[PDB]
Design an enzyme around this catalytic site. Structure first.
Site, PDB file in Angstrom:
ATOM      1  N   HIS A  37     -35.229  38.137  -4.727  1.00 38.66           N
ATOM      2  CA  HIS A  37     -34.842  37.047  -5.926  1.00 38.66           C
ATOM      3  C   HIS A  37     -35.518  36.038  -6.023  1.00 38.66           C
ATOM      4  O   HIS A  37     -35.267  35.199  -6.855  1.00 38.66           O
ATOM      5  CB  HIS A  37     -33.110  37.243  -6.078  1.00 38.66           C
ATOM      6  CG  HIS A  37     -32.537  36.251  -5.140  1.00 38.66           C
ATOM      7  ND1 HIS A  37     -31.854  36.630  -4.318  1.00 38.66           N
ATOM      8  CD2 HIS A  37     -32.670  34.781  -5.109  1.00 38.66           C
ATOM      9  CE1 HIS A  37     -31.341  35.526  -3.653  1.00 38.66           C
ATOM     10  NE2 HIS A  37     -31.988  34.457  -4.163  1.00 38.66           N
ATOM     11  N   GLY A 139     -30.091  27.325  -1.495  1.00 38.06           N
ATOM     12  CA  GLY A 139     -31.090  27.294  -0.820  1.00 38.06           C
ATOM     13  C   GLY A 139     -31.196  27.787   0.609  1.00 38.06           C
ATOM     14  O   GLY A 139     -32.063  27.793   1.303  1.00 38.06           O
ATOM     15  N   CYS A 141     -30.626  30.949   0.890  1.00 33.21           N
ATOM     16  CA  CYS A 141     -30.753  32.346   1.195  1.00 33.21           C
ATOM     17  C   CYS A 141     -32.092  32.694   1.935  1.00 33.21           C
ATOM     18  O   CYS A 141     -33.207  31.681   1.982  1.00 33.21           O
ATOM     19  CB  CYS A 141     -31.390  32.824  -0.482  1.00 33.21           C
ATOM     20  SG  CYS A 141     -29.611  33.077  -1.223  1.00 33.21           S
TER      21      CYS A 141
HETATM   22  C1  LIG Z   1     -29.648  31.561  -2.285  1.00 32.73           C
HETATM   23  O1  LIG Z   1     -30.689  31.671  -3.366  1.00 32.73           O
HETATM   24  C2  LIG Z   1     -28.310  31.467  -3.110  1.00 32.73           C
HETATM   25  C3  LIG Z   1     -27.206  31.168  -2.015  1.00 32.73           C
HETATM   26  C4  LIG Z   1     -25.688  30.879  -2.641  1.00 32.73           C
HETATM   27  C5  LIG Z   1     -25.688  29.450  -3.305  1.00 32.73           C
HETATM   28  C6  LIG Z   1     -24.669  28.963  -3.210  1.00 32.73           C
HETATM   29  N1  LIG Z   1     -24.010  29.620  -2.088  1.00 32.73           N
HETATM   30  C7  LIG Z   1     -24.898  30.736  -1.665  1.00 32.73           C
HETATM   31  O2  LIG Z   1     -24.642  31.489  -0.843  1.00 32.73           O
HETATM   32  N2  LIG Z   1     -27.800  32.695  -3.698  1.00 32.73           N
HETATM   33  C8  LIG Z   1     -27.717  32.846  -5.061  1.00 32.73           C
HETATM   34  O3  LIG Z   1     -27.824  31.877  -5.715  1.00 32.73           O
HETATM   35  C9  LIG Z   1     -27.558  34.069  -5.702  1.00 32.73           C
HETATM   36  C10 LIG Z   1     -28.822  34.541  -6.594  1.00 32.73           C
HETATM   37  C11 LIG Z   1     -28.364  36.259  -6.995  1.00 32.73           C
HETATM   38  C12 LIG Z   1     -29.768  36.492  -7.738  1.00 32.73           C
HETATM   39  C13 LIG Z   1     -27.927  37.257  -6.013  1.00 32.73           C
HETATM   40  N3  LIG Z   1     -26.517  33.933  -6.608  1.00 32.73           N
HETATM   41  C14 LIG Z   1     -25.086  33.551  -6.093  1.00 32.73           C
HETATM   42  O4  LIG Z   1     -25.095  33.492  -4.823  1.00 32.73           O
HETATM   43  O5  LIG Z   1     -23.967  33.084  -6.856  1.00 32.73           O
HETATM   44  C15 LIG Z   1     -22.993  32.407  -6.188  1.00 32.73           C
HETATM   45  C16 LIG Z   1     -21.987  32.242  -7.404  1.00 32.73           C
HETATM   46  C17 LIG Z   1     -20.658  32.754  -7.003  1.00 32.73           C
HETATM   47  C18 LIG Z   1     -21.650  33.464  -8.099  1.00 32.73           C
HETATM   48  C19 LIG Z   1     -21.045  33.876  -9.385  1.00 32.73           C
HETATM   49  C20 LIG Z   1     -19.529  33.744  -9.671  1.00 32.73           C
HETATM   50  C21 LIG Z   1     -19.344  33.933 -10.975  1.00 32.73           C
HETATM   51  C22 LIG Z   1     -20.070  34.559 -12.120  1.00 32.73           C
HETATM   52  C23 LIG Z   1     -21.481  34.828 -11.553  1.00 32.73           C
HETATM   53  F1  LIG Z   1     -22.346  35.486 -12.465  1.00 32.73           F
HETATM   54  C24 LIG Z   1     -22.029  34.404 -10.264  1.00 32.73           C
END
Ligand SMILES: *C(=O)[C@H](C[C@@H]1CCNC1=O)NC(=O)[C@H](CC(C)C)NC(=O)OC[C@@H]1C[C@H]1c1cccc(F)c1
Ligand SMILES: *C(=O)[C@H](C[C@@H]1CCNC1=O)NC(=O)[C@H](CC(C)C)NC(=O)OC[C@@H]1C[C@H]1c1cccc(F)c1
Lengths: 294, 293
Positions: A37, A139, A141
């Site tokens: 991603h 950040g 990930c």
């Molecule tokens: C690394 O890119 C990042 C790490 C996350 C950021 C905050 N804590 C964590 O572990 N991963 C993402 O941002 C990830 C990207 C996707 C394409 C998988 N998305 C994510 O982790 O979303 C976190 C919030 C709880 C999500 C959510 C809640 C309600 C509705 C949503 F659409 C999403």
């Protein structure tokens, strides 16, 4: 909770940027592994076509850096939810390593990283619902989880997302998620979590090794009988592999696994009756049978 | 969560004298280790270390860094640490400093056996100057440290286990924390107390994790809180402690003394079953700075 020394993994961390999206990658020989991603925009995170985003991409769109030093990307491919970038330099700090997929209940250290830089190391348990209770921020990930056996780093986890409820999900180093999650920015619920029985049993063994053994009884049980009762208390059933990894503690103490299961069955039904085990009224479920030795 | 240990792993070596083996820290061209390595059994109980050290030759010390032996070209003693000059400079030496930490402060420990890193974990200097580690035989010479940007602040080297199972050691100038002595005797610490500012940081932490069942509307002066704290063997809270908790106060909208009022209720009641960030016990080895970062 004792994590593994992180130096061998630190020497593998890099950063990977597409446009403005930066996360961490793992540099091993001449391949850099990271979450796919990284290639997503906002306009495409709500639901991406990864195969389609990837065709638009060329080697020269990928910014890979160890520190501030650029690594030239000479190839790219996508394996499940991980991106593999071939680079023109073999990492001189590559340890002996393997990629393993762990089972729920097993523990591993995580080297939390931001912009390719380690911030901290800590010890996680893969819950039976395939989440971990970590400390990951934006950040983070591409941070990885690992165990170290002798010279060999076993990589088992790469971080991808946080769930609505606050716990975390990710993949193995082959891009296959642990659990029923997908790398889309959609609300996703972890199934209800259960107690890690094998680790509770490990902990009771530890308590016996230290001379705390009031809870042992003269009864025994079948594995099926124990499993059916334990599921009634939101404990995980035991597998044959679980029984096998309790062998060394069974041998150290002389208490057969099924006799320990009977002692646990009694704790589950009657309670502690206001007593403690290793100075705790709570049965701990995040120390594996391997962790107890150490 | 502990600091990444790589910078320190690259300094760990094995030091042997006689039938005693422990770990040393190798910075530039000096290896630091606990002086009790130069002991035996007839010595354990009341060792005259200057006396035993003068009888020692540079060549009695075997230093191994990995598969390599290091030649000792000089030895001296600074309090309870032996300093071995060696003919080679560690190229993995990081930017570092030697610091003595305050009780209540935290640090990471790299546990080593035979010069090899085996695990890393986070500890706090207890107010009675012990630490609650997992150290086994041969872990002597393991070090504790913090990392700020590129610089490793070394603050602990491990020397002994007390009969209660907690641990004792020195700074890197060889001065013990606490009233302990590097002789083979059963030693007791003073009565330990709970690190109050850290419990508060940890309560703010649970709040940030949307856990707030322990909060309340009651309030308390700083002195009235300290009276209760001391009653339950909690460290007093200083106005510096209050200042330090500011950021967590801001971020949660919970005044420091409101959280103190919450902690007072918990001490007098109990948890009555409930739990905070998993624990049935009030956790006191996260500092405010920790919980921030
Ligand atoms: C690394 O890119 C990042 C790490 C996350 C950021 C905050 N804590 C964590 O572990 N991963 C993402 O941002 C990830 C990207 C996707 C394409 C998988 N998305 C994510 O982790 O979303 C976190 C919030 C709880 C999500 C959510 C809640 C309600 C509705 C949503 F659409 C999403
Ligand atoms: C490192 O060499 C080692 C580390 C200890 C070993 C066990 N766990 C741990 O952390 N340090 C020592 O063995 C140390 C050496 C002295 C000369 C300072 N002694 C020690 O750790 O003693 C532990 C038990 C409490 C001691 C004791 C009990 C009864 C009677 C005694 F004389 C001593």
């Amino acid at each position: 909770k004792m994590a593994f020394p992180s130096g061998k993994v630190e020497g593998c961390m890099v950063q990977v940027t597409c446009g403005t999206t930066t996360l961490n990658g793992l540099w091993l020989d001449d391949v850099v592994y990271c979450p796919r991603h990284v290639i997503c925009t906002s306009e495409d995170m709500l639901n991406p076509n990864y195969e389609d985003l990837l065709i638009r991409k060329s080697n020269h769109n990928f910014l890979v850096q160890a520190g501030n030093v650029q690594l030239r990307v000479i190839g790219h491919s996508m394996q499940n939810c991980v991106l593999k970038l071939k680079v023109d330099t073999a990492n001189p700090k590559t340890p002996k390593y393997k990629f393993v997929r762990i089972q729920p209940g097993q523990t591993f250290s995580v080297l939390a990283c931001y912009n390719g830089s380690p911030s901290g190391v800590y010890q996680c348990a893969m819950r039976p619902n395939f989440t971990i209770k970590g400390s990951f921020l934006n950040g983070s990930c591409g941070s990885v989880g690992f165990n170290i056996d002798y010279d060999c780093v076993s990589f088992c986890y790469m971080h991808h997302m946080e769930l609505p409820t606050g716990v975390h999900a990710g993949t193995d180093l082959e891009g296959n998620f642990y659990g029923p999650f997908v790398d889309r920015q959609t609300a996703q619920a972890a199934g209800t979590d259960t107690t890690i029985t094998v680790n509770v049993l490990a902990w009771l063994y530890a308590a016996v090794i230290n001379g705390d053994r009031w809870f042992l009884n003269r009864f025994t049980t079948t594995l099926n009988d124990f499993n059916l009762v334990a599921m009634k208390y939101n404990y995980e059933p035991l597998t044959q592999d679980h029984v096998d990894i309790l062998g060394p503690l069974s041998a150290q103490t002389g208490i057969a696994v099924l006799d320990m299961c009977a002692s646990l069955k009694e704790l589950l039904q009657n309670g502690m009756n206001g007593r403690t085990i290793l100075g705790s009224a709570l049965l701990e479920d995040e120390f594996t049978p391997f962790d107890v030795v150490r």
